[PDB]
């Protein structure tokens, strides 16, 4: 609710959909963010997507067809740069 962290993995040889590697909330979410930054994993703020995925998905699952492109757009930007 207050704080959300969703980890995203991606490998196109396995499926065209991104894969959710973690879902944490509140204080644990804040620790995920700090560690991610410390170990050089990009942390991207997108408040509506974070909520969406939290409300629709369980951890260790592929993003459903409905939200695939909204998630993939982030990976594509990070690749463009």
């Amino acid at each position: 609710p207050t704080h959300i962290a969703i980890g995203i993995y991606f490998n196109p040889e396995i499926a065209p959909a991104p894969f959710i590697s973690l879902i944490e909330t509140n204080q644990c979410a804040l620790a995920v963010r700090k560690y991610a930054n410390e170990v050089g994993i990009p942390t991207v703020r997108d408040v509506k997507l974070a909520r969406k995925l939290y409300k629709t998905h369980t951890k260790y699952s592929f993003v459903d067809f409905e939200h695939l492109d909204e998630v993939l757009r982030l990976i594509v930007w990070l690749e463009q740069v």
């Binding site: 969703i6 980890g7 974070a50």
Partner: peptide
């Protein structure tokens, strides 16, 4: 003081990004 378990740390290390609100 460690907040995260080993498996969560690994999951983070194995991700392309973390999406947050």
């Amino acid at each position: 003081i460690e907040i995260l378990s080993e498996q969560t740390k690994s999951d983070i290390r194995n991700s392309k990004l973390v999406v947050m609100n």
